[PDB]
Design an enzyme around this catalytic site. Structure first.
Site, PDB file in Angstrom:
ATOM      1  NE  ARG A  14      27.838   9.284  22.844  1.00 39.67           N
ATOM      2  CZ  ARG A  14      27.013   9.555  23.854  1.00 39.67           C
ATOM      3  NH1 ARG A  14      26.143   8.645  24.272  1.00 39.67           N
ATOM      4  NH2 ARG A  14      27.065  10.751  24.445  1.00 39.67           N
ATOM      5  CG  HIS A  15      32.657   9.841  23.409  1.00 39.29           C
ATOM      6  ND1 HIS A  15      31.810   9.962  24.490  1.00 39.29           N
ATOM      7  CD2 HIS A  15      32.267  10.786  22.517  1.00 39.29           C
ATOM      8  CE1 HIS A  15      30.954  10.944  24.268  1.00 39.29           C
ATOM      9  NE2 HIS A  15      31.213  11.464  23.080  1.00 39.29           N
ATOM     10  NE  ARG A  18      29.197  13.789  26.236  1.00 39.95           N
ATOM     11  CZ  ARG A  18      28.134  14.419  26.730  1.00 39.95           C
ATOM     12  NH1 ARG A  18      28.221  15.063  27.891  1.00 39.95           N
ATOM     13  NH2 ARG A  18      26.981  14.408  26.065  1.00 39.95           N
ATOM     14  N   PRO A  20      29.672  16.300  31.436  1.00 37.81           N
ATOM     15  CG  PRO A  20      27.718  16.850  32.571  1.00 37.81           C
ATOM     16  CD  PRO A  20      29.066  16.238  32.777  1.00 37.81           C
ATOM     17  CB  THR A  21      29.768  19.342  26.201  1.00 39.07           C
ATOM     18  OG1 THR A  21      28.333  19.266  26.137  1.00 39.07           O
ATOM     19  CG2 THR A  21      30.433  18.285  25.337  1.00 39.07           C
ATOM     20  CE  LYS A  22      29.488  26.873  28.367  1.00 37.62           C
ATOM     21  NZ  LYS A  22      28.328  27.675  28.840  1.00 37.62           N
ATOM     22  NE  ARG A  89      33.075  13.936  23.702  1.00 39.63           N
ATOM     23  CZ  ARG A  89      33.143  15.261  23.646  1.00 39.63           C
ATOM     24  NH1 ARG A  89      33.952  15.926  24.466  1.00 39.63           N
ATOM     25  NH2 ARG A  89      32.406  15.925  22.764  1.00 39.63           N
ATOM     26  CG  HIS A 303      31.923  12.560  18.527  1.00 36.63           C
ATOM     27  ND1 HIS A 303      32.316  13.076  19.744  1.00 36.63           N
ATOM     28  CD2 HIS A 303      32.988  12.690  17.699  1.00 36.63           C
ATOM     29  CE1 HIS A 303      33.560  13.515  19.652  1.00 36.63           C
ATOM     30  NE2 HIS A 303      33.990  13.287  18.423  1.00 36.63           N
ATOM     31  CG  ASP A 304      26.090  11.427  20.560  1.00 33.23           C
ATOM     32  OD1 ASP A 304      26.684  12.323  19.916  1.00 33.23           O
ATOM     33  OD2 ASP A 304      25.583  11.611  21.701  1.00 33.23           O
ATOM     34  CB  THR A 305      26.724  13.813  15.974  1.00 39.02           C
ATOM     35  OG1 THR A 305      28.150  13.907  15.858  1.00 39.02           O
ATOM     36  CG2 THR A 305      26.258  14.557  17.210  1.00 39.02           C
TER      37      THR A 305
END
Length: 411
Positions: A14-15, A18, A20-22, A89, A303-305
């Site tokens: 994972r990166h 970071r 927050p995305t939004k 990221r 990514h975590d996903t």
């Protein structure tokens, strides 16, 4: 087993930390308090995040040089191949990893040149490689959950109430608006949990209280890992409370990323890439990178996903001591190829390498002896899980991959 050789490693990382995305109106409306601002543009790796990834890279270096897979000093260009997703990221995480595993060595990360398009290796459904069917997806996600989405309020009653108390939800604009409607301010039930597949079948999203609570719990953990002074308005303390709050986040990732009828589609390119690189099948389907015969480590910056998709496909489940996020910042899903020198049968092992909450918040130097990164061996479904490293036979592992992939989703 004893005396096996470590032949090759794939790290699906994972990166790092970071911003927050939004910041949606909903996220602002569920608390009277103000979210602390971040020093970096939305979605970017913070400088502290890079430093934490570099610390993990130094640990990976000590660990695999102790094993001997990596020689002392700078690795060559053929020894390590590092590929990152197109996000800033992930690209910067990849370089910070190299700076730690090979300090001052000038190794370079690789990535898709067109940053204005998703990379189908990491996001094949979004890229349009294969589509999700909405009807099928609603059915099989309910089957994995074991009941309708309305059961989440009861299954997670205490964490939902805990999140509402952290938010001071009773005093929030959202609650005031519910009370205007004569409804109560039960945070677990502020709205329905909903799964929506978009019209072309390139996106599936969970929204509602579980989704929001998963997002906000991760933000609190990111605040903490960034060393911000005020985490969750000083209303989240105690390892017990971190574990329970982040169980919402982990449950959301279980439902939306580990369920095989979603994971299969999103994760097939990465699983094929992991498998073909691990055994170094340089021209097999799903081997898209210019890997050398001398490749020792493939680093995949994702990514975590992605990690959760791979876990759902392979039937991986783990819990991390002192790390309440199952897919934590900078944590790696590590695949090892072990070979018996007596007969050259090979084996696959899986480990989750991670930094604890304190190792992140305090930016702790990691070392083999005094302060190692967390390492959790992971059992693989349908595998032999032999010994301390939970080894799977190479042939058993390849069979499992063949059963798990969605072959229309290859690149």
């Amino acid at each position: 087993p004893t005396g096996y050789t470590l032949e090759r490693v794939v790290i699906l990382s994972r990166h790092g930390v970071r911003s927050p995305t939004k910041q949606t109106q909903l996220m602002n409306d569920v608390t009277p308090d103000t979210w602390p601002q971040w020093p970096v543009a939305a979605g970017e790796l913070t400088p502290r995040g890079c430093q934490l990834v570099t610390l993990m890279g130094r640990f990976y270096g000590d660990y695999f040089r102790s094993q001997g897979l990596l020689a002392a000093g700078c690795p060559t260009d053929a020894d390590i191949y590092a590929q990152a997703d197109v996000d800033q990221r992930t690209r910067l995480t990849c370089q910070c990893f190299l700076d730690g595993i090979a300090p001052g060595c000038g190794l370079k990360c690789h990535y898709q040149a067109d940053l204005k398009k998703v990379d189908p290796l990491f996001h094949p459904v979004e890229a349009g490689v294969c589509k999700l069917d909405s009807t099928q997806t609603h059915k099989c996600v309910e089957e994995r959950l074991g009941g309708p989405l309305s059961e989440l309020s009861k299954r997670y009653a205490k964490p939902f109430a805990q999140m509402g108390e952290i938010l001071n939800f009773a005093a929030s604009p959202y609650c005031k608006s519910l009370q205007q409607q004569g409804k109560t301010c039960d945070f677990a039930n502020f709205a329905a949990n909903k799964i929506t597949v978009n019209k072309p079948g390139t996106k599936v999203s969970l929204s509602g209280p579980l989704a929001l609570s998963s997002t906000l719990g991760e933000i609190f953990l990111l605040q903490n890992s960034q060393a911000m002074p005020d985490v969750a308005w000083h209303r989240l303390t105690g390892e017990d409370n971190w574990i329970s709050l982040l169980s919402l986040h982990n449950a959301q990732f279980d439902l939306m990323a580990k369920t095989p009828c979603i994971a299969c589609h999103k994760g097939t390119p990465l699983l094929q890439q992991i498998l073909t690189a691990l055994v170094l099948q340089r021209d097999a389907q799903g081997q898209t990178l210019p890997l050398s015969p001398q490749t020792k480590i493939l680093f995949l910056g994702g990514h975590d996903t992605n990690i959760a998709n791979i876990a759902g496909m392979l039937g991986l489940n783990w819990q991390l001591p002192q790390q309440p996020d199952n897919t934590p910042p900078g944590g790696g899903l590590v695949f090892e190829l072990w070979q018996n020198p007596d007969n050259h049968q090979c084996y696959v092992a899986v480990k989750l390498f991670y930094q604890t909450m304190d190792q992140l918040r305090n930016a702790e130097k990691l070392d083999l002896k005094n302060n190692p990164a967390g390492i959790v061996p992971v059992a693989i479904d349908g595998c032999e899980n032999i010994g301390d490293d939970k080894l799977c036979q190479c042939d058993t592992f390849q069979k499992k991959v063949a059963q798990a992939i969605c072959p229309a989703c290859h690149i």
